[PDB]
């Protein structure tokens, strides 16, 4: 059982959230620019807490990955196949949401 480091000045629950931020796959500049793109259609005077952008990004990447997990789980072939839009849709109907 590996030795665990527990900083005296920062709780691990904080460290874990910062760690997950570094694991995100979409570049953060294009991500915030996509939020801007959406926000412009609502209201030109909208502001966003930085923390809100981060929450949006963490959840959005999870949402996308789960769509692929579901498609993966519904795809059973001896030889590997390329995933198409129809595959996502069916898997969503079998395993996915609403």
């Amino acid at each position: 059982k590996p030795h665990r480091y527990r900083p005296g000045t920062v709780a691990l629950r904080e460290i874990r959230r910062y760690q997950k931020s570094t694991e995100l796959l979409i570049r953060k500049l294009p991500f915030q620019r996509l939020v801007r793109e959406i926000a412009q259609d609502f209201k030109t005077d909208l502001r966003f807490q930085s923390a809100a952008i981060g929450a949006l990004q963490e959840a959005a990447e999870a949402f996308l990955v789960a769509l692929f997990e579901d498609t993966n789980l519904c795809t059973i072939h001896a030889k590997r196949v390329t995933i198409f839009p129809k595959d996502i849709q069916l898997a969503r109907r079998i395993r996915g949401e609403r």
Partner: protein
């Protein structure tokens, strides 16, 4: 016949890696555009609810808390957060 779509924004390799993170190793051409489109629609959906909360609070800033209450309304993604 074949054609390369232009964009500014979310790159093919990011989308390939998101798919891979879900176990999907091979995606078709349309998956790239579809992934960007789905991502945008999901964000619109969350932001629509978040701004509904923001306006209810009579604020002009969307807070992380507005985004949480919104996310909880979008189904399984954040299900169970906060207890």
């Amino acid at each position: 016949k074949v054609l390369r779509d232009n964009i500014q924004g979310i790159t093919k390799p990011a989308i390939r890696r998101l798919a891979r993170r879900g176990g999907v190793k091979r995606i078709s051409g349309l998956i790239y555009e579809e992934t960007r489109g789905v991502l945008k629609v999901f964000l619109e959906n969350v932001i629509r609810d978040a701004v509904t909360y923001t306006e209810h609070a009579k604020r002009k800033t969307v807070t992380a808390m507005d985004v949480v209450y919104a996310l909880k309304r979008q189904g399984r993604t954040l299900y169970g957060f906060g207890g």
